[PDB]
RNA sequence: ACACAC
């Protein structure tokens, strides 16, 4: 088991305020709204995106590392449906999106100019 | 199941 230490534990050498969201049971259409509904109480979300390239996944970005730490520690193993759409969460390696519009699979919670690009 | 989701 990993001992808690700075510069070694996941929470002290891999934190970039960005997280990856893996869906275990995509029996329903996942959207940026439901991901925001569970991520917003964990902190002020800034961006959300969804992709299907290798399965079913989503991404989230926070205004602070502290919001990403409690989101990754509370929403992990949680479910969107309260019976299905189970989650897994970990720190992401990229650090910024290049969002171009807002819709059910892509969104930006601070740039209003992408709302008309739908 | 790691953003570039058209």
């Amino acid at each position: 088991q990993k001992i808690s230490r700075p510069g070694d534990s996941d929470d002290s050498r891999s934190v970039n305020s960005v997280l990856l969201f893996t869906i275990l049971n995509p029996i329903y259409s996942i959207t940026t709204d439901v991901l925001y509904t569970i991520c917003n109480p964990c902190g002020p979300v800034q961006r959300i995106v969804i992709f299907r390239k290798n399965g079913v996944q989503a991404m989230v970005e926070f205004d602070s590392v502290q919001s990403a730490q409690r989101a990754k520690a509370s929403l992990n193993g949680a479910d969107i449906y309260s019976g299905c759409c189970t989650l897994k969460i970990e720190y992401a390696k990229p650090t910024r999106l290049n969002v171009f519009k807002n819709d059910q699979d892509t969104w930006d919670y601070t740039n209003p100019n992408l709302s008309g690009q739908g």
Side-chain angles (χ1 to χ4, degrees), chain A residues 12-74:
Chain A
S12 294
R13 51 59 172 209
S14 290
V15 320
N16 64 351
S17 301
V18 188
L19 299 172
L20 168 66
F21 283 66
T22 329
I23 294 88
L24 309 190
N25 297 305
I27 90 300
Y28 285 121
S29 297
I30 310 301
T31 92
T32 86
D33 175 27
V34 320
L35 295 174
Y36 166 94
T37 288
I38 65 173
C39 290
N40 177 46
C42 295
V45 171
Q46 301 303 315
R47 290 184 283 244
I48 295 190
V49 171
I50 302 183
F51 41 70
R52 326 293 178 149
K53 62 177 185 179
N54 294 309
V56 183
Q57 311 99 310
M59 298 282 292
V60 186
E61 176 172 357
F62 285 97
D63 196 16
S64 69
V65 169
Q66 293 75 18
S67 292
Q69 287 181 347
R70 60 189 169 217
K72 183 262 297 188
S74 181

